[PDB]
Amino acid sequence: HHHHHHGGLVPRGSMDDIYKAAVEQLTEEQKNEFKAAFDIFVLGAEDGSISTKELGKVMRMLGQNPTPEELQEMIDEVDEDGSGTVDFDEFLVMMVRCMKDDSENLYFQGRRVRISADAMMQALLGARAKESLDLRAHLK
Ligand SMILES: [Ca+2]
């Protein structure tokens, strides 16, 4: 409907709503997975936060070779304040938005959109592994 744009010039004292929404959409197990993904994205971070190189890195793996300008525009476009860099807070809400955004935009008969979120997630996980639970005994 109207929602809320301005921060009310009153930082902190809330933010609980954002966390609550994430919890409702993301489960405890899912939340842990999210953190794991964040750590991977944080790896190689020039400024400690996702950048053109980080985003470009995954693009190369997908077989895509986007220009530096394209990556910069994408970050600025998705950026909350257009700072040009996505921080932990911005990254967290960004992921949540993409989740509900995709759900909202479905209607019927989808179209080949670059890559699917599920496909990317599966690629990150690669081969299934549960040897973590069993260390002394190896069963595969
Ligand atoms: Ca930003």
UniProtKB/Swiss-Prot annotation:
Residues that coordinate or bind Ca(2+) 1: 79, 81, 83, 85, 90
Modification sites for N-acetylmethionine: 15
GO CC, one annotated term: cytosol
Transmembrane annotation, as ranges: none
Keyword rRNA-binding in annotation: no
Gene Ontology MF terms: actin filament binding; calcium ion binding; calcium-dependent protein binding; protein homodimerization activity; troponin I binding; troponin T binding
Domain of life: Eukaryota
One GO BP annotation of this record: skeletal muscle contraction
Keywords carried by this UniProt record: Acetylation, Calcium, Cardiomyopathy, Disease variant, Metal-binding, Muscle protein, Phosphoprotein, Repeat
Free-text function comment from the UniProt entry: Troponin is the central regulatory protein of striated muscle contraction. Tn consists of three components: Tn-I which is the inhibitor of actomyosin ATPase, Tn-T which contains the binding site for tropomyosin and Tn-C. The binding of calcium to Tn-C abolishes the inhibitory action of Tn on actin filaments.
Other known facts: Cardiac muscle Tn-C can bind 3 calcium ions per molecule. Domain I does not bind calcium.
Disease: Cardiomyopathy, dilated, 1Z: A disorder characterized by ventricular dilation and impaired systolic function, resulting in congestive heart failure and arrhythmia. Patients are at risk of premature death.
Protein name: Troponin C, slow skeletal and cardiac muscles
Complete-protein stretch covered: 1 to 89 of 161
